[PDB]
Symmetry: C5
Subunit: 86 residues, 5 copies
């Protein structure tokens, strides 16, 4: 698994299993990181493209501002959001 966080050009933060072939990024199990509360901030993962059943999503790398590896806290929740556990 290559789990990374993409800041999109639309402003959102996406988290998923990423592979970069050609000039395209293929994303599996993609979630948007929605923060919220002036008290502590709880991060919420929700499915990025709720209007589709597609397993893989392709975006051109031009539509991504940064690709970044998540804090351990965030990978654990992502993992428990997508798979079966220890």
């Amino acid at each position: 698994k290559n789990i990374k966080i993409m800041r999109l050009v639309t402003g959102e933060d996406i988290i998923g299993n990423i592979s970069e072939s050609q000039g395209l990024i293929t994303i599996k199990k993609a979630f948007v990181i929605i923060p919220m509360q002036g008290k502590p901030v709880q991060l919420v993962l929700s499915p990025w493209q709720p209007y589709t059943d597609d397993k893989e999503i392709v975006i051109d790398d031009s539509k991504v501002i940064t690709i970044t590896s998540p804090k351990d806290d965030i990978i654990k929740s992502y993992e428990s959001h997508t798979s079966e556990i220890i």
Copy 2:
């Protein structure tokens, strides 16, 4: 070929798509407004044009819709 395009402007559009050259031609295009009930409304209400062309650089993702979305789109 009914697909859902997330535009660079943030919107989600649904329509009959064909990709020739580096352009996408869209027939019968609707914007998906959520509020959950999803509502389809005509994308470009200011025009009678049957086909609309966008450069693919202005689309973030092209994705195939869930069955209930297709049914509603069809019924429109």
Copy 3:
């Protein structure tokens, strides 16, 4: 005289006399289409109010769609530039 509607990348809808030479669009008598309600009515207002320029040039990369307007919209546009 070619009147079309351009959806800009900034979100706005512009209407004007359009000519496409090189990879640039030249626009004459350009108006923004502002809609509103409280029957949804459309209002045309000058696109670039800070200038007297008769022609404005935009790279076509900043336009999402170029589309021919409904008859009602042309009539109002025609009446607005008179």
Copy 4:
């Protein structure tokens, strides 16, 4: 000296002394035009976080470059 108004791709309207060398625009004395509600325009410094005299933007980040109405040049001139 060449005072023009640039609509940026971020939405803003900037006014400044513009020179176009290479595919880059260099701006001196740059102000953002903020309107508010007979509409009143206010010029405020574009980049308040810097003392730089010249600022460079790639022309792909500019939607239009346009010459200002006389009333706007006068105010700009008096702002400097």
Copy 5:
């Protein structure tokens, strides 16, 4: 130390240690400048969801790169240790 302020294409203003190799900008210790309310500024970490020390952005996503006023560097420096 090359501390600069980048206005991104998404609207934000970032401050950090910048190096430009290839057509990419590498940023170390990056903070967003949030203003509020006298002009009043807060520096907060730009990418809070990551531990990465370096962040790479294509220069096409940056509108302007600009050197900060002295008081902004001093805060940035005191915010970085």
